Design a protein around this ligand. Structure first.
Ligand SMILES: *C(=O)[C@@H]([C@@H]1N=C(C(=O)O)[C@@H](S[C@@H]2CN[C@H](C(=O)N(C)C)C2)[C@@H]1C)[C@@H](C)O
Ligand SMILES: *C(=O)[C@@H]([C@@H]1N=C(C(=O)O)[C@@H](S[C@@H]2CN[C@H](C(=O)N(C)C)C2)[C@@H]1C)[C@@H](C)O
Lengths: 256, 256
């Protein structure tokens, strides 16, 4: 098995689940193993923002200071003086993984416990949002706060992006943002041929956790939804993006 | 001088122009020397496309056939059967240097002769569009068809991307496609300090011509607009991407 081999090669533990929505074929490898979701949660978080706001409501302007800024604020740091609309915060959070943007959105939806409630409402009993960004990244093995599984992230991302947890114009915003992600070139995108459209959201945390979740549109045929998660046994361990890229090529082989 | 030393190391001719939009300082080395523009023209071509369409017009679906495919078609070869929208064609052209994408876009704006006339209209009396792709890359020394200069490409790229040849929303589309280019990692991007954002478009053509034009954003402050062009004296000469990267570093020192 190629997935076992990857784990061997990169001294890491993989979580994989992929679903071909056209065939209902799946590819699983530790699909129900828990991993820190890290910033992949940003995607489900915007899912819930969109469900709870009209499109026009995303034009509301959010004011903030350097106190609402945290460790990684690539877009938010530019706009302290003017603020940002919810729409521009969605963009920043999904496409640059802006942590402060995530916290600001999370506050608009009522916080982690309110995100959790909303995910339970759409059918996800697995994903456990507990903390703000960045501290959600600090997860020790055995703990369950701020964790999910490859199976559940796929199911939940599909529910918002492709099914009926959102109306079509809102699913379109979500997919556009995710399609135009900037943080993912060496991950799922590097394990798919060019001209296969990918919408993804990356994550990284402690214990060398390195995640990517995606919807992949092959040139014709229905989309594949895919989570590829990984983690290692030392708290301060490095991850290797190539593992996600290689895993991704294995999934596509197995599905075709 | 460092630029001469790069010319000597790489046995090539360099064309450099950079402009610091903050201070109006410039860095020039053979700024008015002509080079084949190659696929850098794609950026300017989208600038015109954007100027002549509403953003919503970009969703017009273009149907095309396999005759429209040329030598290098990474995205467009996957969608002969469905076609692609103008928006999707712009993305393919800019982020993958898709040649067929560029030729379809060129046909939508009326062809190279029409593109040239739109460039004259924004003030560019230098850039000489004449052929479709890839034939545009066959330029012998002393010839002027499909050539420009480092100064002109910088001037024209600024005009569309930063000044008033487009309204802000279309500038934003242009800038985002170029920020997310997949073809430029070993060029200007390699000579810029980490975490400065870069929008770029690359090119290569006969006589070992190797090009990259870009906009570079210091973390705070106004952007730098940059062209780094090169060529060599044999028709079938190889280029070296490291030339462009090293020239870029020199540009950055001379501006800091
Ligand atoms: C996400 O998991 C965390 C923030 N979002 C990120 C991302 O998904 O890219 C991280 S990733 C980590 C930081 N360094 C690596 C890198 O390639 N960069 C320099 C961006 C990846 C980012 C801190 C969030 C939980 O903090
Ligand atoms: C334009 O310059 C040509 C197309 N655009 C390119 C690019 O910018 O990437 C070229 S150049 C060259 C061929 N191999 C190099 C490479 O490393 N790859 C991207 C695979 C780039 C591409 C053919 C057009 C004029 O043909």
């Amino acid at each position: 098995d190629d997935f076992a081999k990857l784990e061997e090669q990169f001294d890491a533990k993989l979580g994989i689940f992929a679903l071909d929505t056209g065939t209902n074929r799946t590819v699983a490898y530790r699909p129900d193993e828990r991993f820190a979701f890290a910033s992949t949660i940003k995607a489900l978080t915007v899912g819930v923002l969109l469900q709870q706001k009209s499109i026009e409501d995303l034009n509301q302007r959010i004011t903030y200071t350097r106190d609402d800024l945290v460790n990684y604020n690539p877009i938010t740091e530019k706009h302290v003086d003017t603020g940002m609309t919810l729409k521009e915060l969605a963009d920043a959070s999904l496409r640059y993984s802006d942590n402060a943007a995530q916290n600001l959105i999370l506050k608009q939806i009522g916080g982690p416990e309110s995100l959790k409630k909303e995910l339970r409402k759409i059918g996800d009993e697995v994903t456990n949002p507990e903390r703000f960004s960045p501290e959600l990244n600090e997860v020790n093995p055995g703990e369950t706060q701020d964790t999910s599984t490859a199976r559940a992230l796929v199911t939940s991302l599909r529910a918002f992006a492709l099914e009926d947890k959102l109306p079509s114009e809102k699913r379109e915003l979500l997919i556009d943002w995710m399609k135009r992600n900037t943080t993912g070139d060496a991950l799922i995108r590097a394990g798919v041929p060019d001209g296969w459209e990918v919408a993804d959201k990356t994550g990284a945390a402690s214990y060398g956790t390195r995640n990517d979740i995606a919807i992949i549109w092959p040139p014709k045929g229905d989309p594949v939804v895919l989570a590829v998660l990984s983690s290692r046994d030392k708290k301060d361990a490095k991850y290797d993006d190539k593992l996600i890229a290689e895993a991704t090529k294995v999934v596509m082989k197995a599905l075709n």
